[PDB]
């Protein structure tokens, strides 16, 4: 079950097409994680969900509501 990547020979992991959020970094854009019965999978890193913006020269979006979110920063 050998997979070849630019980082080096990767053995004992299953290569897959579909991408997910990076979990354990290998380098050269390959991230590996534990997934379903379960095994170790190596996949191309997913940069995030794609979202085109419905832009046009006379369309504007105005929020109608708000959420007061509290987040934590540690130093």
């Amino acid at each position: 079950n050998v997979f070849q990547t630019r980082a080096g020979c990767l053995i004992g992991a299953e290569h897959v097409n579909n991408s997910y959020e990076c979990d354990i970094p290998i380098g050269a854009g390959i991230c590996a994680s534990y997934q379903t019965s379960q095994s170790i999978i190596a996949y191309t890193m997913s940069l995030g969900a794609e979202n085109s913006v419905a832009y046009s020269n006379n369309s504007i979006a105005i929020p109608t509501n708000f959420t007061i979110s509290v987040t934590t920063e540690i130093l």
Partner: protein
Amino acid sequence: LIANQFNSAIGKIQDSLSSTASALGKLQDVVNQNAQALNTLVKQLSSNFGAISSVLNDILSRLDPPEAEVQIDRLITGRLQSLQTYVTQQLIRAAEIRASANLAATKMSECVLGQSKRVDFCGKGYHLMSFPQSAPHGVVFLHVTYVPAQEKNFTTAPAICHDGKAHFPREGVFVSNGTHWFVTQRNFYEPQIITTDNTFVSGNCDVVIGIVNNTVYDPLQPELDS
């Protein structure tokens, strides 16, 4: 409504901290690196450093000075480099902490003591207020931030012609729900009827691109009409 959103917001912070320790990793890392480095420092003492025995008393006891010197001088040089390395480890790591301390001090001043308009300097979204909390060898901030929630589509236009004179918003945007024209504040949808109190005239229609015909209302006129 805000109070409920704020109060529930604090509640979530506890559970995120109460059950999951991944949040406090960054403070935890500083403790480990120092404690781990110190352990290495002490461990180096038991390394013979190319001498007959790591324990000083042995080479002290078993051999009298004339040969003891050459053995000890190897131990001293070995230990000294080990201590030299540890200090340079601390000094470099000391600089990193200070850069974090000044960054914290800057946040404490610009983010707690005052509202700061620097974007994402104080947690994602527009910033309202910050609360500080102490922590082992650290400070933890609660950033209370305002985030727009439910967007909506509206057709818009730069300006309005009323009498050939182009009208721009004093504040806010010109939005139409499809059949009527309104001016509303930028970040929240509370459309109001368009009046000269909301708009200031400039120039004539032709220059501005995209301007749309509509009616601008004047509060003074119906009062003089009456």
